[PDB]
């Protein structure tokens, strides 16, 4: 998971809503699958892929490399966007190649079907 | 070991020479210890730490986290200067040249004992 500092503690919910609009798109039947979530654990904040949360609930699930590239590039994009800082000193994919994602704008939002993948 | 792209083949010896001039400086007897090397292997290029090369020769050496961070931040620095591009799709540390790090110019190098940590005996 990636350790994260937010600027102000309200922001957790802003970040949570923004992650709703970042994932694998099915641009044909306009469905977008949420990839990563924000969790606070033991006081520190983290960007977590949906599979790590499935792993946290006991499921023997393993991220793929495509999966952790996706997570690292969503975390780096929200940093680019100035919404999270990635706590210094972690080893991450900082240049993508392998799977990328779709970001939907807050007003394309309701035109799209937002489906959380955390095998609901 | 970090895979890198070079702008043109003759940039290899350019980087090989740059890496001799950046590392841990003992200024009281002016020795600069180089620790990262550029590698060509099957037509691809790599920034590699001397412990990965000692490792690659059969020695029982452990790269610490501190070694990987120095190697990656020297790859980031060469990238900032435009001598290389790190290849996308690799996990790296952020650039952080904290503890002792020094770059010495080309003109000034004749006063430094440039010393590869790779060849250091014992």
Curated annotation (Swiss-Prot), chain A:
Keywords: Repressor, RNA-binding, Translation regulation. The keyword Repressor applies. Disulfide bonds: none annotated. Residues 15-37 bind DNA. GO terms for biological process: regulation of translation. The keyword DNA-binding does not apply. GO terms for molecular function: RNA binding. InterPro entries: Transl_repress_RegA (IPR002702), Transl_repress_RegA_sf (IPR036516). Pfam families: Translat_reg. Controls the translation of a number of proteins (such as regA itself, rIIB and at least 35 others) by binding to their mRNA. This is Translation repressor protein. It comes from Enterobacteria phage T4 (Bacteriophage T4). The gene is regA.
